[PDB]
């Protein structure tokens, strides 16, 4: 593995090293505005397949293709809806992923064997410069072991993958903290498949109101058009209990369980903004924007220690809040103590 520190400023030749790797059919981890992605050349079955391997990822769970130019979209998808052009021209480059019907050049191995392809234009200097220089599209899911928390720093990528992959570009920590929003434009009205860095409300202002796939709220799915729907994800080794309801009643409830779970002789931490006494306590932030930014730091911080159980305070499902609650809820496999 080669780690390229590009935190301070970007230096062309550094990124060129990695571009070579991408071309050589090797794996390269890169920063994005959302999470680090584990990238391969998208036009190379072999390269791509290396990704599912490294991750332990079912060939079933599709990948997202990252582009840097609007013209490469027409290359990867056919019969592009009008809405897609409107969302792309308003929100790309940005934390938005569009599901479209697949052009023929895109390998079935990327899409998990569907005529539907997921595409994004990452809003990050490096992610874009990498794509340009490597003169190829990059298929790139979250750069973690399948099932575990998402990476939001090179440290996180490295503790999962140092040794086992050729390259990690270190860009510092990712600005937003959670994955891109996936919108399905292969149906009318469109469907939100994964809540993300781009709030629903913003998208609904542009194109019409959209529907929400029940996957978002924990319906198991036989077949997945996008990542983060089928299989477990975002989950530490530990157990996670998410508690939601009004401020005090949630805090109160958290306190009962700390003590309850301490009596059973279990080590316990909490994620939230409420100030309890336990082995571990990670403060997520005052604002949702801040919470989204720290969510995986926290989940990984807890996992590295030896807490056997984690208690997460819920948050409002508006804005980035829809994503955090989605992630937490899917981390615990839907253990949600609802308080009234
Ligand atoms: C790697 C990053 O782009 C991730 N796949 C996302 O959609 O947010």
From Swiss-Prot:
Q: By its UniProt entry, which SUPFAM superfamilies does this protein fall under?
A: YrdC/RibB
Q: Which residues bind ATP?
A: 57, 61, 116, 142, 150, 194, 234
Q: Where in or outside the cell is it found?
A: Cytoplasm
| TM helices/strands, residue ranges | none
Q: Which reaction does it catalyse?
A: L-threonine + hydrogencarbonate + ATP = L-threonylcarbamoyladenylate + diphosphate + H2O
Give the E.C. number(s). Answer: 2.7.7.87
Which domain of life, per UniProt?
Archaea
Q: Could you name the Gene Ontology cellular component terms for this entry?
A: cytoplasm
> What's the stated role of this polypeptide?
Required for the formation of a threonylcarbamoyl group on adenosine at position 37 (t(6)A37) in tRNAs that read codons beginning with adenine. Likely catalyzes the conversion of L-threonine, HCO(3)(-)/CO(2) and ATP to give threonylcarbamoyl-AMP (TC-AMP) as the acyladenylate intermediate, with the release of diphosphate. Does not bind tRNA.
What family is this protein classified in?
Belongs to the SUA5 family.
* Name the record gives this protein: Threonylcarbamoyl-AMP synthase
């Amino acid at each position: 593995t080669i780690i390229i520190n590009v935190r301070e400023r970007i230096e062309e030749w550094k990124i060129r090293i990695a571009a070579g790797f991408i071309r050589e059919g090797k794996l390269v981890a890169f920063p994005t505005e959302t999470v680090y992605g584990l990238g391969a050349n998208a036009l190379d079955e072999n390269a791509v397949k290396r990704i599912f391997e490294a991750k332990g990822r079912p060939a079933d769970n599709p990948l997202i293709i990252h582009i840097a130019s609007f013209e490469q979209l027409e290359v990867l998808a056919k019969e592009i809806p009008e809405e897609a052009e409107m969302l792309a021209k308003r929100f790309w480059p940005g934390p938005l992923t569009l599901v479209l019907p697949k052009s023929e050049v895109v390998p079935r191995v990327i899409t998990g064997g569907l005529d539907t392809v997921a595409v994004r234009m990452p809003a990050h200097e490096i992610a874009l410069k990498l794509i340009e220089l490597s003169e190829r599209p990059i298929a790139a899911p979250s750069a973690n072991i399948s099932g575990k928390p998402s990476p939001t720093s090179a440290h996180h990528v490295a503790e999962d993958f140092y040794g086992k992959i050729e390259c990690i570009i270190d860009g510092g920590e990712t600005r937003i903290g959670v994955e891109s929003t996936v919108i399905d434009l292969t149906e009318w009205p469109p469907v939100l498949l994964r809540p993300g860095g781009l709030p629903l409300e913003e998208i609904e202002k542009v194109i019409g109101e959209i529907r929400i796939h029940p996957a978002v709220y924990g319906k198991s799915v036989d077949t997945a058009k996008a990542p983060g729907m089928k299989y477990r994800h975002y989950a530490p080794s530990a157990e996670v209990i998410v508690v939601e309801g009004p401020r005090d009643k949630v805090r109160r409830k958290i306190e009962e369980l700390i003590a309850k779970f301490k009596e059973e002789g279990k080590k316990v931490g909490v994620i939230g903004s409420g100030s309890y006494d336990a082995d571990e306590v990670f403060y997520l932030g005052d604002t949702v924007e801040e919470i989204a930014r720290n969510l995986f730091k926290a989940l990984r911080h807890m996992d590295r220690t030896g807490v056997d159980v984690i208690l997460a305070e819920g948050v409002e499902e508006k804005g980035l809040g829809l994503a955090v609650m989605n992630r937490l809820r899917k981390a615990s496999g839907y253990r949600i103590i609802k308080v009234h």
